[PDB]
Design a protein around this ligand. Structure first.
Ligand SMILES: N[C@@H](Cn1oc(=O)[nH]c1=O)C(=O)O
Lengths: 67, 180, 86, 49
């Protein structure tokens, strides 16, 4: 009797809608973008300092082909 | 509260990167010049001009993308000249994106003005003068955007209703824009 | 004995440094290169600043309101008002 | 069918807006058979749901 006239459906509209929502209200304007972390650009340093060592190994193998 | 802009610091231009990045940039700029210094100043080396005054200056010109005076004429010198170039390609380009990322977000920041925005913005709390004509106007409300407020204003914690208007202006002034 | 920095070359080193261009002239002193160093770091920020903001104009549009709330109607004397007779 | 009647006696406002629209859209968004109901998706190439 309550379902054919939608009293129960309105109670479904009652209890799950009155508790406060978590929808687009915090996806809308509760974001500001951060600065870049080091970890976003960390792998460039590993290629850099790894390139620093790989330059040092070829400088030592020139010492063989110079001698 | 009328949102006057907060003035940034004078050191706010470097805000797209973290200041932990910038210190690691300088430590990298020091080490790359010294590694090239040891490569250049080798014991049989002819005509290798890259001293500690040049290799400090060559890496600076490579980092700022403004060219250089001379390039390293040695294979191990071209390696460190190579990886520093791919270093300074990314760090400059990553700075351009996050500085664009700050400004694209900042123009999407819209002020709540049409009172539908006020009906949706739970971050800014809103209240009325109780025992007047405003509070009764939302009591017998027949518009759903008004209905949401009277759903909220009865249910907000603590009391958003303010007894006098002078304190009603004061809860705007105290919250600095957190309250309506 | 070669002071290639004239008053007419100091403009030209500084200009292509502002226009991201490679210059043939380089400072050869510690008192000289500190000038060219911080001028390089200056233009690195500014061109990135110009690129960033112009994206933000084109990404987010914001069409301005010419007239508002009848105080702007009194000061504006370009528009013509309209009313209905009878 | 049973879909059109489910929006007829609708008690949810997001469902209510559809039954406000589906009765009022021009031309007939209701389709007699499902094969033509798939066809108005295929013809519109994403303009129709
Ligand atoms: N003067 C008003 C009272 N009032 O002032 C406000 O600013 N809101 C409000 O309800 C009244 O006659 O009821």
């Amino acid at each position: 009797k309550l379902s054919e006239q939608g009293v129960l459906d309105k109670l479904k509209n009652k209890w799950w809608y009155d508790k406060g929502e978590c929808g687009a209200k915090d996806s809308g304007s509760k974001e500001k973008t951060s600065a870049l972390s080091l970890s976003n650009v960390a792998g460039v340093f590993y290629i850099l300092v790894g390139g620093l060592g790989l330059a040092m190994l070829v400088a030592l193998i020139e010492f063989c082909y110079k001698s | 509260k009328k949102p006057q802009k907060s003035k940034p610091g004078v050191f706010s231009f470097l805000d797209p990167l973290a200041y932990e990045i910038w210190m690691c940039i300088v430590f990298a700029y020091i080490g790359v010049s010294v590694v090239l210094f040891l490569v250049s100043r080798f014991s049989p080396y002819s005509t290798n001009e890259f001293g500690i005054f040049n290799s400090l200056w060559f890496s600076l010109g490579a980092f700022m993308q403004q060219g250089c005076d001379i390039s390293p004429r040695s294979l191990s010198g071209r390696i460190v000249g190579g990886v520093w170039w791919f270093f300074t390609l990314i760090i400059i380009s990553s700075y351009t994106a996050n500085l664009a990322a700050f400004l694209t977000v900042e123009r999407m920041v819209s002020p709540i003005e049409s009172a539908e925005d006020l009906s949706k913005q739970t971050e800014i709390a809103y209240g009325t003068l109780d025992s007047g004509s405003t509070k009764e106007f939302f009591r017998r409300s027949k518009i759903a955007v008004f209905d949401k407020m009277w759903t909220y204003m009865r249910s907000a914690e603590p009391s958003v209703f303010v007894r006098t208007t002078a304190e009603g202006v004061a809860r705007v002034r105290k919250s600095k824009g957190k309250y309506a």
